[PDB]
């Protein structure tokens, strides 16, 4: 038992030298780079179309591949895929588990997914059954609630859960292909990489963990928050990670420099952050708060780019299109809004 204590002290002295080493690679700050950069200053957006028709709150939404179709996830059961150009519904899929929590969209536009509280990630087929859309593949196997699901390829699906597991799944067998354990709290959201080789996971542990897709071990473990990690999304190349917390502190972490680059807090903000997903540029971050309004922040220059208000209740999920032509927010008043 004493050698396990020596093991713990060995761990402590080693991460002491590592956390002192990580400071050694960072002598300047990000504030010394925003001195010769032309800021945006003010920018605002006019609401274009409001997709209405849901009966209870909107919990998550996912953008399409062509940036025309989106998929919306009500909490009365309905999973409705909309065409955002003509402002019209394409399909309305009733469900088994009413309490959905996150949906996603295929890279080929063929399949959708439904993460539930009833512990079964269902996968639905769309374009091969234009009539009578039924449940294609159930993905039972978790114990806790499933909290975020995406599509790696059209055969591979990355589902995070509540029992800390965060497993990678294969549709053809219905079996847990690769498990990524290591956490000790509720894991809330995932965000896939461009190369589909990495992915970043934020949990209740106030920590982010960057994982490979193949071996299955934690490569990186970032920290620095004082509460839950409530959503993450990150840069289009795979070297900078934007993290939204419950302490209202948006953070921008680096993979190459390995340390937390940017913090953002303010004094007028005591509401926690529900979703952060940001633009094709390295300028705009988009945050959603519990004060019922979206806040567009500028990345390198920590100043208010703008406020997108207009919701009746808490914003629950956010989405930027692939081509940047729109920004959609979905709040707890059953009204999606598209902004450009």
């Amino acid at each position: 038992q004493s050698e396990l204590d020596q093991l713990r002290q060995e761990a402590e002295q080693l991460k002491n030298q590592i956390r002192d080493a990580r400071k050694a690679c960072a002598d300047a700050t990000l504030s010394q780079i925003t001195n010769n950069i032309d800021p945006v200053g003010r920018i605002q957006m006019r609401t274009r179309r409001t997709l209405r028709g849901h009966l209870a709150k909107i919990y998550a939404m996912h953008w399409g591949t062509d940036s025309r179709l989106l998929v919306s996830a009500s909490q009365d059961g309905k999973l409705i895929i909309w065409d955002s150009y003509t402002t019209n519904k394409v399909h309305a899929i009733p469900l088994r588990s009413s309490w959905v929590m996150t949906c996603a969209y295929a890279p080929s536009g063929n399949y959708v997914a439904c993460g539930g509280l009833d512990n079964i990630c269902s996968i639905y087929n769309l374009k091969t059954r234009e009539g009578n859309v039924r449940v294609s593949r159930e993905l039972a196997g978790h114990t806790g609630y499933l909290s975020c699901c995406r599509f790696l390829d059209d055969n591979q699906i990355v589902t995070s859960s509540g029992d800390t597991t965060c497993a990678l799944w294969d549709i053809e067998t219905g079996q847990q292909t690769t498990t990524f354990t290591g956490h000790t709290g509720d894991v809330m959201s995932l965000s896939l990489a461009p190369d589909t080789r990495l992915f970043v996971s934020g949990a209740c542990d106030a920590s982010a963990k960057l994982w490979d897709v193949r071996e299955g071990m934690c490569r990186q473990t970032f920290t620095g928050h004082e509460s839950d990690i409530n959503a993450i999304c990150f840069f289009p190349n795979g070297n900078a990670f934007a993290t939204g917390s419950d302490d209202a502190t948006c953070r921008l972490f680096d993979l190459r420099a390995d340390q937390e680059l940017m913090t953002y807090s303010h004094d007028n903000i005591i509401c926690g952050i529900t979703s952060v997903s940001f633009s094709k540029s390295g300028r705009l971050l988009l945050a959603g708060y519990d004060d019922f309004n979206c806040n567009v922040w500028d990345a390198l220059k920590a100043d208010r780019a703008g406020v997108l208000a207009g919701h009746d209740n808490r914003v629950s999920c956010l989405g930027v299109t692939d081509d940047g032509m729109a920004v959609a927010t979905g709040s707890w008043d059953s009204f999606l809004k598209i902004w450009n």
Binding site: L117, N119, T143, G144, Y145, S147, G162, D186
Partner: peptide, 12 residues
């Protein structure tokens, strides 16, 4: 069947 925590799924 969930583990012994609230305040992530009790907001639902």
């Amino acid at each position: 069947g969930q583990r012994d925590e609230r305040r992530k799924w009790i907001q639902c």
